[PDB]
Design a protein around this ligand. Structure first.
Ligand SMILES: [Zn+2]
Lengths: 100, 504, 47, 115, 284, 202, 70, 97, 107, 45, 97
């Protein structure tokens, strides 16, 4: 209980030194084609597990085509964490990335 | 021999203090012989062996004394002891589990796994089980999985299901904290028998049973009496046959007995402070979670029909519940078309529904259709086909299902129709949505041969017109399905004759 | 020369950080190129 | 296409070992429909269409007291063109424990074949 | 060294061994006869020599030749545990064809363990077949035969939107192509649909959205193992995969009355494929 | 030298907090609040309501059951907070979806209210039944307590009932009531039923 | 045997059921009965606005045990 | 077609089971059991070097259940000399014949 | 998918304390007990009661294996998803005396 | 009616128990099995 | 792989190292009998197919008590009486010698 609180304190302070704030983030403002392929694959893997879907599906039964309909209407509730090779990261949302 | 062996089993427990465990493996091995094997311990020394154990329980609990206790557990037919030997074995189980509640993991296995027998055999199985439900509150948990592990399989005899489900609503009347987990186990494993039978039913026109007399067969059983080292790889004649005439009788047995037991529960004196509120609410939640997503399932939703019509308020608590599902904006499209499909068939095929409750459904059902008159009627010549209005094409059909079966409640001698149906239908038929083409072929033509006669709306020049103009198969068949068609079950319709309206 | 680099890795007491794509397949890990070069996180509404 | 498999019951049996296994059918140990593909001598009727997993000859061994079959294991179905049976010469005056059986596998030109 | 241990001398000498578990040492049969495992044949030769020396230490302690019998035994208990780990280290019989390759030669080769069973593997849910030309399929499509179509399956989780399509897959069953072969319950237990008939499968198909009584698995739903449809995709392949356009994502079109995989002409230069009996590996 | 090599093993089995008495009545306070940190999964179905998903999956199967990490019977929980996976308090937090499966994972703080008896603790309990072997009790009307006769004094005897079992007589001649004060000898988690083993003697 | 096979049916310890790790973060600080009566008021009456039915059956006894007599 | 193995779980019945894709075995009612292994080692007389030879035999689609010594030899050499007849090792008999 | 999931995906049990796969073992329980996963070399056997002012083992740290050897501790095991050949490597490497220590840091 | 054929003399032949595998006319060891009137069916394609 | 069975923990790094001679805390099997089998095929106690090393031939394992498809297998140890050198690390002991 004393070692864990010291371990938790390090674990979350190390993880706060590695977060880049929303103004200082310098990566690309686009969705880099490997993000679009994993966002659609992760969202559709949630829609297949009865996630609340925010789009009117017109009798589309493919989960992956339903996630491609949320991406087009900017309705996916995900956040991309972009790692830099020293471990630091930038949290870009799916709403503010530019989908090509 | 009453004076002799009282030393032999009191010094046998000294030999479990002498700690070599020799005489344990002979004395408790003889009780592990079956009750059909007559070379066991009789009732004589069982009064004698046990009273050594009961007033000296501190001297058995060694881990090598497990077989001393592992043979008393499988002491078969303990419920048929004479009533002064009976209260002595029952008292040993009450002082074992009060001493060491490690074995109620093991004893409660045995009580649940013997509710196969009728009520009259298990009047002493429950009072042991109810004892450690009141004594041991952390036994509501693991016994609840034992009821789900040892349910009778569907390839069993017919008497296991009719007596296990009878002894388990006996269980529910004493432990009301465990009744949501009672009804969830019955209703789930009634569907398992139920849904193998509507395919067994015939086409859209049924038969007469070709039986001028019927055989219930009380005596349809034998007696209740009831390997070399290897077998060898076997061969043919699997003959995987079904009781095609037996599955309906099991569903005759079970689903009447459910409605028999619930009808003694719900009553105007249990809605005051008893289990009237509890059972009618635990079935409506179980309605909208279990049966309503079973596709194409006749003959289980009559349990909801049965309880709703013991009370006038149990209609008004369900009619708006049926409306709260069928017009919930948040639900899925198939969870509302099937819900509206359950609406019109319920109002029509119900004998005990009051005259004001018929119209108040249709009052709200006409209130939905005229709020629709500007909000979506301008979207017809816009882009997007007629699949957008399947909710409208279902709620119109549920209203036209009532006029096919309950036209004669809305009308007085003077002819004044409620909500001006004589103005309403022919104004909705001439709408841009054309609701005579997209609904079901039968119920909209059954509306056509009636609204001409009952002088409300004329549409034989429009159904003539609409079929001359000439994704979907999941929507035809949710319209063709009727929840309250007449019943293939025969002993349950006898109750339903008082409750259910036929064709005329 | 599997068991010469293995001998050199044990004498060194070398911690494999598991980041080359030939190291992650041994340990059965998602590769760190392309679709594995980031993380997906789900913005949940309620507190 | 023709193929020959040699059934040799003298295979695992040793040099001084007596005769254990015998062609034909042992008595009172009887799976039926083995009589559909096979004759009374434990050898197949010739002209029989055999699929994979069919009994291609049946024998009876004495170290197991069981009547057992030999199984046609080839994905291509065949017929039985011939059944020869070979007498002993090194250790004479004994019964048949070498049987060669010839199949025929018909070959219509399928899509994928090469002309 | 944050554990602040000490470099000890016992790290270079083996005081004991360990013996791998029985599953990793099951008897290595061949043909249609069972033979003893190879890794026991040089682990018994260690263990007889550890039994020779156990008796001869008692022979010395109850009071010469007892040392030449003992030092010669150290020549081979060293050499047998040498032959147990390496094999090129030990001379031994020196007649050729040294048996029991030992735990190094199980790791070092082109095959070894680390390139035949870690960096390359064998996969489930894959097929291979001879390819054949077609100009009537798309350029992004493959023609899948109905031999492969009734085998390769996809665990589709049943939900509120696919239940209209996945009821019909259970009613079709393993026989028809737009069908299923197994349903997975919420307890993880499978139900094969093979031996059933239409009335069993039509009954079950109506039970795909019924919730379980079990609350530990209430999150889950069932998983129908439907056959491979026209909306699935597929990785194709050829035997020299020299670049990454020799392995691409074709969509599926299931073509009846065909026994070979079937490919459009726009792909014949990317796979470096000529239609002369080449096989392509298909991964699902 | 084993005063540091083995001393963690003693700290592993040293009890953290002991149970003191309240209002000088002997009854040792075994009810206690411990704050824990969980690492839980989250379904996609509760991805619109993530606090109900932690409660119904992980925390509701954890009440009234013995937990090995906290050493007591968990009586509930209070004040659940999902920890955000981003160091930015608010509503719109975010959890980290696994690569393989669609499930997410997160850290949570919650205050458990566990009931924690240890050896040498003094408790009440209604006498449930009493044979000439033992007494069975319910501590706090929930928990099985078995005071056995070897731990009962010798100076007490067992009157036996006539037809229906038998009552109890102490040194005072009192037919004893249910309300009995004893000392915990052992705490058994041999099954899914928490068994307190007790003595009457000091 | 029939109660020796299917060991995972009695396991029930998947990661959808049990949390992965649990660590206490302070020391357990003792509570007052005037908090236990306050907590079990606000916890039982909040869980009654579906499992958790057999557990509240046990907390209703403990809540009454700190205030009543059967 | 149905071969022997262990018994069927799922509170179904005690039975024998059935293959599906030749290496996994299911019951007669659909339910599937856990992972039969099918020990194999490939080819290419030859095929390496001959090591040893002992008497066990794989017959249980995976692990082995055959060739265990003299569990039947006690009833082997007391059934060999009853088939042929009339050995003519005759005493008081043939005085009759 | 083409190397882990469709070839030899297993959910093994790994001790967090010693970082090992092949040293774990499901315990053989009391008949009133549910079995659980326990580590062998992270376990001190029960005839090592080294003597709050006195220490009792907390009755859930005590487990038994199939022969009847009682052990204390051996808990803190987790479930990871590995290929199976990581176990067969770790038995071939232990025969060399080489030990792998898996750092299961997502805890 | 048991029928084999010898491969040398083509003399039709029956073979009982405890017989040599030889022909009875010639002394030939190879001896082939005949076919009887038994039903096999073919799609004429 | 099933998507309904998530895994919370995963491996970050792998430390190489040497097993000390305190396999005694790991291994309590002690494999000493060089004979492996006997008549009628039961694995001999102490031999190299000891049933404390995992289930084998429809038996149950002596250590974990599970069948052939649920047991991991367990590691036993051969006590060498004399310290034979590790043949991997011989070239580096001959440097410090
Ligand atoms: Zn079953």
């Amino acid at each position: 209980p004393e070692d864990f609180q010291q371990h938790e304190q390090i674990r979350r302070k190390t993880l706060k030194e590695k977060a880049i704030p929303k103004d200082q983030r310098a990566t690309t403002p686009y969705m880099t084609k490997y993000e679009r392929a994993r966002i659609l694959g992760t969202r559709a893997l949630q829609i297949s597990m009865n996630a609340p879907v925010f789009v009117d599906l017109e009798g589309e039964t493919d989960p992956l085509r339903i996630a491609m309909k949320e991406l087009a209407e900017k309705k996916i509730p995900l956040v991309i964490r972009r790692y830099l090779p020293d471990g630091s990261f930038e949290d870009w949302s799916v709403e503010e990335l530019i989908v090509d | 021999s009453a004076a002799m062996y009282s030393r032999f089993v009191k010094s046998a427990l000294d030999d479990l203090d002498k700690n070599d465990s020799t005489q344990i493996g002979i004395i408790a091995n003889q009780v592990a012989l079956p009750s059909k094997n007559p070379e066991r311990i009789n009732d004589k020394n069982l009064n004698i062996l046990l009273d050594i154990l009961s007033s000296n329980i501190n001297r058995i609990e060694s881990s090598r004394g497990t077989f001393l206790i592992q043979s008393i557990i499988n002491f078969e037919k303990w419920w048929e002891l004479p009533p002064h030997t009976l209260s002595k074995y029952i008292y040993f189980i009450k002082i074992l589990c009060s001493s060491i509640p490690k074995w109620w993991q093991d004893v409660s296995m045995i009580l649940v796994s013997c509710f196969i027998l009728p009520i009259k055999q298990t009047v002493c199985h429950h009072d042991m089980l109810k004892y450690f439900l009141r004594m041991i509150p952390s036994s509501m948990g693991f016994i609840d999985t034992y009821l789900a592990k040892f349910f009778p399989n569907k390839n069993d005899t017919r008497r296991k299901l009719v007596n296990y489900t009878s002894n388990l609503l006996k269980l529910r009347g004493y432990c009301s904290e465990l009744g949501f987990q009672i009804w969830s186990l019955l209703i789930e494993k009634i569907i398992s028998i139920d849904v193998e039978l509507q395919n067994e039913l015939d086409e859209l026109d049924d038969d007469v049973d070709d039986d001028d007399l019927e055989e219930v067969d009380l005596e349809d059983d034998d007696d209740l009496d009831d390997i070399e080292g290897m077998d060898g790889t076997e061969e043919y004649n699997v003959e995987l046959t079904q009781g095609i005439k037996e599955l309906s009788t099991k569903l005759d047995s079970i689903l009447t007995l459910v409605s028999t037991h619930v009808e003694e529960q719900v009553t105007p004196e249990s809605l005051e402070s008893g289990e009237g509120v509890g059972v009618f609410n635990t079935l409506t939640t179980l309605f909208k979670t279990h049966v309503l997503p079973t596709y194409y399932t006749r003959s289980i939703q009559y349990i909801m029909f049965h309880v709703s019509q013991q009370q006038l308020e149990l209609m008004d608590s369900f009619l708006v519940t049926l409306i709260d599902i069928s017009f919930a904006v948040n639900e899925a499209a198939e969870k509302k078309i099937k819900s509206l499909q359950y609406l019109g068939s319920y109002i029509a095929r119900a004998k005990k529904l009051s005259r004001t409750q018929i119209i108040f459904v249709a009052s709200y059902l006409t209130s939905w259709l005229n709020r629709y008159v500007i909000e979506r009627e301008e979207e017809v010549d816009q882009r997007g086909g007629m699949e957008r209005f399947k909710h409208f094409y279902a709620a119109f059909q549920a209203l036209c299902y009532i006029f096919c079966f309950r036209h004669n409640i809305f009308r007085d001698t003077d002819g004044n129709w409620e909500c001006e149906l004589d103005k309403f239908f022919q104004r909705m038929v001439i709408s841009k949505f054309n609701p005579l083409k997209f609904c079901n072929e039968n119920v909209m033509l059954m509306f056509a041969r009636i609204a001409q006669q009952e002088s409300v709306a004329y549409c034989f020049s429009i159904i003539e017109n609409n079929n001359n103009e000439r994704t979907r198969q999941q929507f035809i068949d949710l319209q063709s399905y009727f929840p309250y068609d007449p019943l293939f079950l025969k002993n349950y319709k006898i109750l339903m004759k008082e409750y259910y309206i036929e064709w005329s | 020369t599997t068991c010469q680099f293995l001998t050199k890795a044990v004498l060194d007491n070398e911690r494999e950080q598991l980041d080359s794509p030939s190291a992650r397949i041994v340990v059965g890990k998602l590769n760190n190129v392309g679709t594995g070069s980031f993380d997906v996180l789900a913005k949940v509404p309620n507190a | 296409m023709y193929k020959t498999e040699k059934v040799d019951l003298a295979l695992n049996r040793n040099r001084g070992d007596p005769i254990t296994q015998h062609f034909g059918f042992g008595n009172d140990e009887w799976p039926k429909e083995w009589l559909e593909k096979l004759d009374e001598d434990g050898l197949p009727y010739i002209g029989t269409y055999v699929e994979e997993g069919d009994p291609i000859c049946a024998y009876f061994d004495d170290t197991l007291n069981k009547t057992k079959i030999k199984t046609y294991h080839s994905s291509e179905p065949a017929y039985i063109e011939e059944v020869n049976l070979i007498g002993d010469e090194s250790n004479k005056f004994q019964e048949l424990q070498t049987v060669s059986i010839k199949y025929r596998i018909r070959r219509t030109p399928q899509i994928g074949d090469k002309f | 060294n944050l554990s602040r241990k000490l470099v000890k001398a016992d790290s270079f000498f083996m005081d004991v061994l360990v013996v791998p578990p029985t599953r990793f040492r099951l008897p290595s049969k061949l043909g249609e006869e069972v033979h003893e495992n190879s890794q026991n044949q040089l682990l018994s030769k260690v263990l007889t020599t550890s039994l020779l020396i156990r008796d001869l230490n008692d022979d010395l302690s109850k009071l010469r030749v007892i040392f030449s019998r003992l030092m010669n035994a150290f020549v081979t208990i060293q050499n047998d545990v040498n032959a147990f780990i390496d094999s090129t280290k030990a001379q031994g019989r020196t007649s050729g064809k040294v048996p029991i390759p030992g735990v190094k030669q199980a790791l070092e080769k082109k095959e070894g363990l680390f390139r035949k069973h870690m960096m390359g593997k064998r996969v489930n849910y894959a097929a291979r077949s001879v390819i054949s030309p077609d100009p009537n399929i798309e350029t992004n499509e493959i023609g899948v035969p109905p031999v492969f179509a009734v085998k390769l399956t996809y665990p589709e989780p049943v939900t509120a939107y696919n239940i209209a399509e996945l009821r019909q897959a259970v009613i079709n069953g393993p026989d028809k192509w737009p069908g299923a072969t197994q349903i997975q319950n919420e307890d993880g237990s499978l139900v094969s649909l093979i031996g059933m008939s239409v009335e069993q499968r039509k009954a079950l198909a109506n039970q795909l959205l019924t919730p379980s009584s079990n609350v530990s698995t209430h999150t889950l739903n069932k998983k129908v193992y439907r056959h491979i449809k026209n909306r699935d995709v597929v990785l194709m392949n050829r035997q020299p995969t020299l670049h990454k356009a020799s392995m691409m994502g074709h969509k599926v079109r299931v073509l009846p009355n065909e026994k070979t995989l079937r490919l459009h002409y726009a792909n014949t230069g990317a796979y470096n494929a000529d239609f002369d009996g080449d096989e392509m590996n298909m991964h699902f | 030298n084993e005063n540091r090599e083995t001393a963690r093993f003693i700290k592993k089995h040293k009890k953290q907090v002991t149970n003191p008495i309240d209002e000088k009545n002997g009854t040792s306070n075994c009810i206690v609040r411990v704050p824990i940190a969980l690492y839980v999964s989250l379904a996609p179905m509760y991805l619109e309501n993530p606090l109900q998903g932690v409660m119904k999956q992980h925390l509701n199967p954890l009440v009234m059951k013995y937990n090995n990490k906290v050493g007591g019977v968990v009586l509930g929980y209070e004040g659940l907070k999902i920890l955000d996976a981003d160091p930015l308090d608010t509503s719109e937090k975010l959890i980290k979806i696994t690569p393989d499966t669609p499930f997410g994972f997160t850290w949570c703080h919650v205050n458990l209210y566990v009931w924690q008896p240890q050896v040498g603790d003094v408790l009440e309990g209604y006498i449930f039944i009493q044979s000439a072997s033992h007494i069975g009790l319910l501590i706090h009307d929930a928990f099985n307590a078995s005071i056995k006769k070897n731990n009962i004094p010798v100076d007490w005897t067992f009157v036996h009932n006539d037809v229906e079992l038998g009552h109890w007589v102490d040194s005072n001649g009192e037919p004893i009531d249910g309300k009995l004060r004893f000392t915990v000898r052992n705490v058994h988690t041999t099954g899914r039923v928490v068994s307190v083993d007790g003595t009457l003697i000091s | 045997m029939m109660k020796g096979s299917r060991r995972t049916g009695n396991n029930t310890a998947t990661t959808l059921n049990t949390p992965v790790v649990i660590h206490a973060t302070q020391l357990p600080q003792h509570v007052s009965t005037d908090e236990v009566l306050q907590f079990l008021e606000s916890f039982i009456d909040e869980k009654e606005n579906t499992n958790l039915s057999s557990s509240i059956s046990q907390l209703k006894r403990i809540q009454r045990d700190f205030k009543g007599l059967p | 077609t149905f071969i022997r193995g262990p018994i069927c779980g799922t509170d179904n019945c005690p039975s024998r089971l059935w293959r599906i894709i030749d290496g996994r075995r299911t019951c007669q009612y659909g339910h599937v059991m856990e992972g039969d292994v099918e020990f194999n080692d490939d080819e290419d007389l030859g095929a390496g070097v001959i090591t040893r030879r002992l008497n066990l035999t794989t017959n249980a689609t995976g692990s082995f259940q055959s060739s265990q010594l003299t569990n039947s030899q006690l009833l082997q050499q007391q059934q060999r000399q009853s088939h042929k007849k009339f050995k003519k090792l005759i005493g008081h008999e043939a005085k009759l014949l | 998918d083409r190397l882990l999931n469709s070839s030899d995906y297993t959910q093994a049990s790994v001790c967090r304390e010693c970082g090992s796969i092949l040293t774990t073992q499901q315990s053989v329980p009391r008949i009133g007990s549910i079995s659980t996963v326990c580590c062998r070399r992270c376990s001190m056997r029960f005839e090592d009661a080294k003597k709050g002012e006195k220490i009792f083992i907390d009755d859930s740290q005590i487990w038994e294996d199939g022969q009847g050897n009682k052990f204390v501790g051996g808990n803190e095991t987790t479930t990871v998803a590995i290929p199976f050949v990581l176990k067969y490597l770790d038995s071939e490497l232990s025969a060399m005396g080489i030990r792998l220590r898996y750092n299961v840091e997502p805890k | 009616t048991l029928k084999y054929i010898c491969a040398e003399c083509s003399s039709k032949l029956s073979l009982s128990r405890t017989d040599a595998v030889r022909c009875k006319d010639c002394g030939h060891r190879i001896l082939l099995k005949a076919r009887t009137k038994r039903l096999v069916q073919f799609e004429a394609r | 792989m099933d998507i309904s069975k998530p895994v919370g923990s995963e491996i970050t790094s792998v430390d190489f190292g040497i097993l000390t001679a305190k396999i005694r805390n790991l291994s309590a099997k002690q494999i000493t009998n060089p004979t492996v089998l006997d008549n009628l095929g039961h694995p001999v106690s102490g031999g190299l197919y000891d049933l404390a090393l995992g289930a084998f031939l429809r038996n149950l394992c002596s250590t974990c008590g599970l069948d052939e498809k649920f047991c991991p297998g367990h590691q036993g140890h051969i006590e060498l009486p004399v310290p034979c050198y590790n043949p991997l690390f011989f070239n580096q002991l001959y440097i410090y010698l």
